[PDB]
Amino acid sequence: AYTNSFTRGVYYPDKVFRSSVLHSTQDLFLPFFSNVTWFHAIHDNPVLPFNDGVYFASTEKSNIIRGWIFGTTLDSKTQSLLIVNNATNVVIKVCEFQFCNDPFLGVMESEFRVYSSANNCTFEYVSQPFLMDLEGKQGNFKNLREFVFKNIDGYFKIYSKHTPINLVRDLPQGFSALEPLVDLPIGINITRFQTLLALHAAAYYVGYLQPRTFLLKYNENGTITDAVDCALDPLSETKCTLKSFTVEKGIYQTSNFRVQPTESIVRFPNITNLCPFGEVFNATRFASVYAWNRKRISNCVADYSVLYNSASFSTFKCYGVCPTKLNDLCFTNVYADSFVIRGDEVRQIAPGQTGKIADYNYKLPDDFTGCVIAWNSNNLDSKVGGNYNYLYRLFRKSNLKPFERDISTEIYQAGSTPCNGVEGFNCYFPLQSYGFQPTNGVGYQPYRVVVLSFELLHAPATVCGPKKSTNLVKNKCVNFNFNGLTGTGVLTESNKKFLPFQQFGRDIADTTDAVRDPQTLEILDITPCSFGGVSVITPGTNTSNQVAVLYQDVNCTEVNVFQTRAGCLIGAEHVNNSYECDIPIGAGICASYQTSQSIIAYTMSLGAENSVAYSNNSIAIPTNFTISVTTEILPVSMTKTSVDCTMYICGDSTECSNLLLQYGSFCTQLNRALTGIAVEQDKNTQEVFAQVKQIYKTPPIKDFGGFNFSQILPDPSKPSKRSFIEDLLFNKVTKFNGLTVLPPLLTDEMIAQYTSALLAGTITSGWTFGAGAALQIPFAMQMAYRFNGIGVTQNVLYENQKLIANQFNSAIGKIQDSLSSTASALGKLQDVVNQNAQALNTLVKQLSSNFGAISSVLNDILSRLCPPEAEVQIDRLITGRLQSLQTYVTQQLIRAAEIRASANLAATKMSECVLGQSKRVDFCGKGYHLMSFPQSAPHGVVFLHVTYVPAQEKNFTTAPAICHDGKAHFPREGVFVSNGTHWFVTQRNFYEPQIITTDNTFVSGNCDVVIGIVNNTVYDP
Amino acid sequence: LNRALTGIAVEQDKNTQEVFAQVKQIYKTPPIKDFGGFNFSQILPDPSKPSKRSFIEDLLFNKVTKFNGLTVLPPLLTDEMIAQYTSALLAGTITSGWTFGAGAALQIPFAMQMAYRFNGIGVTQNVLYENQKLIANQFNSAIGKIQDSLSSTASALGKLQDVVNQNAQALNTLVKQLSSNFGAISSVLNDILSRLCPPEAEVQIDRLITGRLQSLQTYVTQQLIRAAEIRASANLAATKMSECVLGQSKRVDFCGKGYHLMSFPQSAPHGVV
Amino acid sequence: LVKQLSSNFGAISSVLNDILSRLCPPEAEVQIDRLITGRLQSLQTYVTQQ
Amino acid sequence: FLPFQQFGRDIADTTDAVRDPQTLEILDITPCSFGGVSVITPGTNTSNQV
Ligand SMILES: *[C@@H]1O[C@H](CO)[C@@H](O[C@@H]2O[C@H](CO)[C@@H](O)[C@H](O)[C@H]2NC(C)=O)[C@H](O)[C@H]1NC(C)=O
Ligand SMILES: *[C@@H]1O[C@H](CO)[C@@H](O[C@@H]2O[C@H](CO)[C@@H](O)[C@H](O)[C@H]2NC(C)=O)[C@H](O)[C@H]1NC(C)=O
Ligand SMILES: *[C@@H]1O[C@H](CO)[C@@H](O[C@@H]2O[C@H](CO)[C@@H](O)[C@H](O)[C@H]2NC(C)=O)[C@H](O)[C@H]1NC(C)=O
Ligand SMILES: *[C@@H]1O[C@H](CO)[C@@H](O[C@@H]2O[C@H](CO)[C@@H](O)[C@H](O)[C@H]2NC(C)=O)[C@H](O)[C@H]1NC(C)=O
Ligand SMILES: *[C@@H]1O[C@H](CO)[C@@H](O[C@@H]2O[C@H](CO)[C@@H](O)[C@H](O)[C@H]2NC(C)=O)[C@H](O)[C@H]1NC(C)=O
Ligand SMILES: *[C@@H]1O[C@H](CO)[C@@H](O)[C@H](O)[C@H]1NC(C)=O
Ligand SMILES: *[C@@H]1O[C@H](CO)[C@@H](O)[C@H](O)[C@H]1NC(C)=O
Ligand SMILES: *[C@@H]1O[C@H](CO)[C@@H](O)[C@H](O)[C@H]1NC(C)=O
Ligand SMILES: *[C@@H]1O[C@H](CO)[C@@H](O)[C@H](O)[C@H]1NC(C)=O
Ligand SMILES: *[C@@H]1O[C@H](CO)[C@@H](O)[C@H](O)[C@H]1NC(C)=O
Ligand SMILES: *[C@@H]1O[C@H](CO)[C@@H](O)[C@H](O)[C@H]1NC(C)=O
Ligand SMILES: *[C@@H]1O[C@H](CO)[C@@H](O)[C@H](O)[C@H]1NC(C)=O
Ligand SMILES: *[C@@H]1O[C@H](CO)[C@@H](O)[C@H](O)[C@H]1NC(C)=O
């Protein structure tokens, strides 16, 4: 009866070759994993809906399905497309037919009950004859022939694919693209179709197409190999939104949820009287244009479809509105300006027009809303002897304002002379007339013109169109229409006290806040029905295709379900246990993929909770330490792009360039900004790396006290003398539109030489090469100074020198192992590359946009259209592409500022971390800084920060001071500790107890002042 | 535009994590507040609030004060979580000095910690102990004065209030732009659509689309620039946290004017004090 | 920025008064809107760079 | 190109390749080489050679 559809409904949307690209297209496709009807029967079929397009598929072994019928009645009464394959060729006809039996075609061929006539044919096509399977066979099917049948604007598009199969059961799973084959211009309104079966079995599938958006993957050979149905599910929406088939772990915003209306609400005043249009259009006599009439039409039901459909009118031109929308709109008042004019003067009755009537007798506003209605009256107002009862004002000393009625009869003066009702030179009358006779010319015949002026709704409306009202439903999302004002939202009761004259309320945005119900004068608030963005929480597609959906800022009762302050989270199980944050949701909630396995949501942990065993006489002092190496990765530079604004916008087009010149310096200001950026990328690089006045090199003998630097020093065997670690870093980070990339000034080899010099200086001369000359020093002694710099006596290093070197070497090895396996380690630098690449890919894609033009391709506009019309379309494209460049450049300037700040920070670290020793906490890594080593990286720098971290501690009893002979002895830069029986003095950051003597302590004051002073003895050497 | 705004929203949480999430563990003070006479009751959490914030933090929070496609996302770190981080940083500073920043938190008497801070400015530790009671009273009085100042002068937090105002002003302007015609017959799209039909309506709509899109581009650009300013401030705040609270700063006027001893963080709306 | 005032931006003339003194509102308003759009975009660019 | 395909396209929707209408072979279209030209010069206060 039914089966599960699969990845079979994909066809080539057009005939353009694309390869190695993911292309997003919207067309009528079969939704993935939808239900498709299975029609089987062994030992005619029904008439099916076409549903704006039909997916059809069949499995064959003997060519049982041999044709299709498409139409409305499909019975010799309308044109109906008939496609038949009768062992010779495909025959397509749209002829009528008498189906004097349940049509099917029988098997060689010995039966033909499909038809017995051919009458009133308007199209016939026959392909070349072939020969195929006809005799009776039964079993597994051998050939699956899939088809798509769609009707677009009268064109019947047929797509198909034939493929070998070895399968009797349901549809095979597997991607297969459908090529286009036929486009038939027929123009038939198709609502139903039927199939044709061959009787000596039955097997075929019928699906239906829907307006889905698909993301199509074209491989290197231009064959469609996959597709994503966006509205299939949140994961598919995410993949198409990001235009990729792989989604990294995280949360993405892909769409917006909106509760849809369930029913419409149409509300109008309960008026039964009809508007007296007949008394104006069929008036016995029209007024003269010098004295035009204004009839008010109000408190009635108006129907403008009668006037519009009537063919008796010579013109019906609406300004501001248009004639088929007038039925759903209503007005506070409509006024009818009624007068007779000359035919040739109809053009003057319009906004923006001038002339002796437009200026002297009937002026319209240039913002006029309404309709100009006209018809000739040559058989009513014109008379033999002429009709001289219609007067117009020939002369006036001034023009007229809109809707002014100038009834005055003052004597007009051409020049300047007194007139007192006299007809004389420069004493003329403003009143003139025409003598209209049925025999006068076309332009001299009378026309009856009525202009209907509509005053936009503001106040309660009384003259409304023929739309009937409905009942009102509160507290539900509805699509409402109140007196022509439309929108979607939930209508609720309100406490807004509208004044008796007020009809509408407004929000800050001028949107409707509340309405007065036109039937019952109560005030209803309009709150649009709940909506919000929808985010998809997913582990990467390299792990699982299971996702959770977050509906932002909604309640869960308006749609496992977890209510959070971020929204309603669907698909994630709520876990009481806290963990480290993984994929953030918001409001303290994070999600992760963990174990059966599922996506979980939890309140994030801030770290383990602990307490410090504080007391007024207890100090913890470390007895051992660890040397750790951390990696700090900073962007320094970004790719130095340069864009030819002219070639991008106006590629190889003189006409476009000439139009572009009317926009001035916009281009050169973009070239200037990008040049400035490109230059500053090199300034940034020089400031970070060119901090050494000379190029230093290490000695051939690497006698550095056991410290192994072979993985950070250049390896004299590479085409570019980079270290092992640098090679690892470089192995982790991965045009004809006026878009170029400039090379950097400093090549990678030169950067490596600078980092080599900085490293060799640091190793052989410590910090001295930074301040001035490089002064050689044994490395172990350099470390001794670095230890003194953190309050640790140099003797600690020498005594543990071998241990320290091994820890250092091991730490370096661990970095290498980390860098060799974890690609994400350099994400901070990879993102910069991605951001610049994304910016360019977007920019290039903008060239495909129309921006309102007929075509995105400039040459296609130019080769078909000529300048007076072509220039407008080109200006539209220029505006769009120029705005795109302005956006790109602005984003690059902001990003460049971010990079500059990072480069300045990197230079600061280089100066304070590598050339010196930093006293700034966590500036040169967490811990007590010893030394740092630079390594170069693509568009960036990596610092290896060597830090001293206390490793093991004991609880010792302490005291701020010791009493001896009543004098208070305090330690000379150390602390007092007790092992329970004896007091010792020791350095703060490393347990090394010494006997308390007068050379370790100093005396100030006496025992009665110091809080916590203890009794002891002080040894005097 | 959605991408740019998402990037901003994300970086606001990165900024918060970098400023506050500088401690690997959540520390808590002992039940006995024997800190040598130094009174911290106005900066430590008060175990009685719906959100365990200090008195001063409550004062700070009491001073700082949609259907058009405009939404506000919640922060990842709620105010309670921020308070827990500041509590941990404060407890670490008090009970272990700077040791919790470099590595493990090593307990030390507070008076001795101050002795080290005094040595760090070239003042022998004996000065503190001999004047320890005086110093504690001065500290306690100074804290009380802060409370009195914060309790009466609303303008004290103007630097943070302006940020709120700038974002609010930006949105109010943006929403108001929907009322503009931009050359169209009406700013209301539905009123154009219900009276005019496609060959003429599409032009008026394109005019409104152009105007509203330009308005968004302007808003987003201003937000990106403002966000860069905020990021610089957050980086500075993180730097101070690292050098002022976790350590002791030798940088003149970096951690206030005078010779720096110690600093204490307090959370505030969209900021740190 | 000042030089941008000399640009037509598709208008018949960069000088606003020359448009206004020869053309009347139903046609003049379009040319003026073209100049307003261009000059406003120029200011937006200037302010952003500043 | 598949037998029904006549044109190829680039990311920008520009033509990548064409099927020759007289002989059905596929030809790639690569715009002829172009690029910016920069002038390296000492200041005109020294020399006019570039
Ligand atoms: C200090 O810690 C280091 C390790 O960080 C200790 O060295 C380890 O000592 C054990 C002895 O039990 C050896 O088995 C390990 O192989 C050593 N590790 C390394 C890397 O050499 C050192 O002994 C500790 N010292 C003290 C006094 O506790
Ligand atoms: C510094 O460490 C490197 C680590 O690779 C040592 O080089 C290794 O040396 C051993 C023998 O000494 C070889 O068996 C390995 O194959 C080498 N590895 C590589 C990657 O070359 C180097 O010898 C150490 N330096 C010193 C002075 O011992
Ligand atoms: C505290 O340290 C002292 C100094 O090392 C310890 O004293 C000595 O103890 C050893 C036996 O462990 C004797 O052989 C020495 O002669 C002692 N010397 C002195 C000067 O007393 C003392 O035992 C330690 N106390 C604890 C509890 O560990
Ligand atoms: C340190 O030792 C001195 C004397 O050796 C202690 O002072 C004595 O204090 C007790 C109790 O107050 C008196 O009874 C003695 O007469 C005092 N003797 C002298 C010489 O002053 C002092 O109290 C001790 N410190 C502590 C903390 O107990
Ligand atoms: C630290 O200072 C606070 C200041 O408020 C002290 O709490 C006050 O304590 C006194 C009595 O000790 C009460 O009368 C006040 O009402 C308290 N004020 C508040 C706001 O609670 C606190 O006791 C001081 N700490 C110590 C150890 O003395
Ligand atoms: C297939 O159709 C049946 C009813 O005909 C329906 O209950 C079922 O849910 C459909 N399949 C899917 C996957 O929705
Ligand atoms: C199929 O129909 C065509 C119609 O012209 C006919 O010529 C052909 O012979 C038929 N095929 C047979 C009889 O196998
Ligand atoms: C078909 O042909 C007949 C000729 O007898 C003609 O009268 C009729 O109008 C034509 N059209 C239809 C739809 O029957
Ligand atoms: C097609 O025919 C149906 C009647 O079956 C009718 O309702 C529909 O409006 C027709 N389509 C057109 C475009 O007239
Ligand atoms: C593309 O065609 C070539 C034939 O030269 C073939 O070797 C290659 O595997 C094909 N690629 C795909 C993805 O089918
Ligand atoms: C006014 O509207 C109500 C709503 O149902 C209707 O019953 C009433 O008859 C209307 N008034 C007139 C005069 O028709
Ligand atoms: C005018 O009168 C004619 C008949 O003389 C009638 O058919 C027409 O509908 C009338 N028009 C109006 C607006 O009353
Ligand atoms: C991601 O995919 C690659 C190749 O499919 C695989 O080697 C890698 O282990 C995957 N990632 C994880 C975390 O397993």
Ligand SMILES: *[C@@H]1O[C@H](CO)[C@@H](O)[C@H](O)[C@H]1NC(C)=O
């Ligand atoms: C919606 O959220 C409110 C918030 O207080 C809650 O009280 C209510 O029960 C939730 N569910 C509904 C309205 O169905």
Ligand SMILES: *[C@@H]1O[C@H](CO)[C@@H](O)[C@H](O)[C@H]1NC(C)=O
């Ligand atoms: C988690 O805690 C809640 C307390 O509100 C409790 O109702 C729930 O059953 C707990 N779940 C588990 C698995 O412990």
Ligand SMILES: *[C@@H]1O[C@H](CO)[C@@H](O)[C@H](O)[C@H]1NC(C)=O
């Ligand atoms: C110090 O003493 C406290 C007392 O409870 C203990 O919890 C803590 O672990 C001790 N420190 C070490 C390093 O063992």
Ligand SMILES: *[C@@H]1O[C@H](CO)[C@@H](O)[C@H](O)[C@H]1NC(C)=O
């Ligand atoms: C430490 O605190 C205890 C409280 O149990 C007190 O008796 C002792 O005198 C205090 N010592 C110092 C030095 O403050």
Ligand SMILES: *[C@@H]1O[C@H](CO)[C@@H](O)[C@H](O)[C@H]1NC(C)=O
């Ligand atoms: C530049 O020109 C001025 C005046 O012509 C001259 O004095 C100056 O020396 C020139 N610069 C150099 C580097 O000679």
